[PDB]
């Protein structure tokens, strides 16, 4: 059900995240690798360096985008968890959508369109928050 809940409202799609989480890596890359290496006549494409380099670039950039997302989740704290809150309050500037409509009667696509320009501020705040949390952890464990 890849992108099955894409037109569903926010929160309703939050139960499909694992299905969305997979197939960005392995599920499409590993399977396509096995299929590509399954039939004979591999040399009919290995010999053509242009196609091989194009496919390698596609695979490498897929892995790099996945690693970018994973490192961003790590540097904000709480990686390896698909849904995880933080301690950064939501500004009224960021679309001021204090309605319940944030979690109902609005698709994730429209919401991504809404706050597209506030993203980097949030990411910097998350980075600083994780820095503060780790410093506090080290200090308290020292105590």
């Amino acid at each position: 059900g890849f992108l099955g809940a894409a037109g569903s409202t926010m929160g309703a799609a939050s139960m499909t995240l694992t299905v969305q989480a997979r197939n960005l890596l392995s599920g499409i890359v590993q399977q396509q690798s096995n299929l590509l290496r399954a039939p004979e006549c591999q040399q009919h494409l290995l010999k053509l360096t242009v196609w091989g380099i194009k496919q390698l670039q596609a695979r490498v950039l897929a892995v790099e985008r996945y690693l970018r997302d994973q490192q961003l989740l790590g540097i904000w704290g709480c990686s390896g968890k698909l849904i995880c809150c933080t301690n950064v309050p939501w500004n009224s500037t960021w679309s001021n959508r204090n309605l319940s409509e944030i979690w109902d009667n609005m698709t994730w696509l429209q919401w991504d369109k809404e706050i597209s320009n506030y993203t980097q501020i949030i990411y910097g705040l998350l980075e600083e928050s994780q820095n503060q949390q780790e410093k506090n952890e080290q200090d308290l464990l020292a105590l």
């Binding site: 992108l3 099955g4 926010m10 299929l35 309050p89 994730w108 696509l109 919401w111």
Partner: protein, 448 residues
Amino acid sequence: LWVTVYYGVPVWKDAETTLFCASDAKAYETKKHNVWATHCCVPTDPNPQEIHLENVTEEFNMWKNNMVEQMHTDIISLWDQSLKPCVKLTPLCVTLQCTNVTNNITDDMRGELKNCSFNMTTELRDKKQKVYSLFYRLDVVQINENKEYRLINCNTSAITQACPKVSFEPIPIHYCAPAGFAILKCKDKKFNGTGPCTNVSTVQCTHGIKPVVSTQLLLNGSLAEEEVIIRSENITNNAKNILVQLNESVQINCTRPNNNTRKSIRIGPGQWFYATGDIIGDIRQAHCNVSKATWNETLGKVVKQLRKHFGNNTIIRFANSSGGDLEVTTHSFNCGGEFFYCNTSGLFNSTWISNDSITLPCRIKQIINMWQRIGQAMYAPPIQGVIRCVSNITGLILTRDGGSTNSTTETFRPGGGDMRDNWRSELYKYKVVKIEPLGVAPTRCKRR
């Protein structure tokens, strides 16, 4: 409220990436040294999966669809790679002495087929052999004027022979996106080529597309079952091509009633040159029979849709194309390994103010500059026997006459267009989008 970071969000952005080919029915059916099957060795899904996107409305644009550019680059690269190891034909450029073919030839082809002969190298460098072969006049040019002749691409580019075993027959092609990307397929009935579309679904691979090369008539394509559709980036702008998709296939039967016999000459240490040895039977021009009544009905439907787009208080005319190269002034296509150039003046000759069959003459061209490049030239080997192809004409490439003509009569010509347009007729439904799994949202909950 507080920030929550979500991974696995189902959202996307428009993007351009590299798609990879995949084909079905390749176990033994297409293992005849077919180019497309050889390159597209990746198997498809035996049971392809399609996911409908409920309540999703997305903006599509066929005239900015990077899949078309990807397909154009891929097919040109595949063509060049297929021709690359095949033998070269530089020694053919030697001076060519020709006479006319008068052996049971009809009046139509008088001068179309020339019996040429020439000195050529052998496996040993110091020994030369005089050989004889037939050439169509389109690939032969006179010089020093009396009977001396030259190949057309002698002074422009080296001529490569297509490998005889290799076949360029179209097969279904599925473009599959890599990981992190999805192909959104529109399902708006009578989609006019751009703008919003609902009923959208998602796929990992496109439906089977036959990469059929034609220059005036779209062949073996898909049918717009709902009604005849007309698409163009700007109807007002006469410089833009018009792609007309039909809701019924038109029947065309093209043929070369000549029982060809093919010679095989050794030119060098490991090099074979193939030349049209002779014609066993009578010589008659290659031609295409088009179902006349079906063509009349098809033009009627197209004229109705053209009236809806332009108006029903003006006359609509069809006239044959203007001047230029054979690649554009005629319906050029591939049939059974040979190449046809058919004069389409018998079709687009009509006016619509308010058992029969049409015969299109067709010439045969061997030395070809495919893709309208300059530095390359492909020599199609002759093909033994008699060639017949039965094709569905499914779409037309029309260009409105540039003149205003007092806004009285609008004349549409089969002007053809760029190769990309053909695949646009099969790639208007699709759009490539990269997934953006990471997002943020408000919540009522905060980290401890």
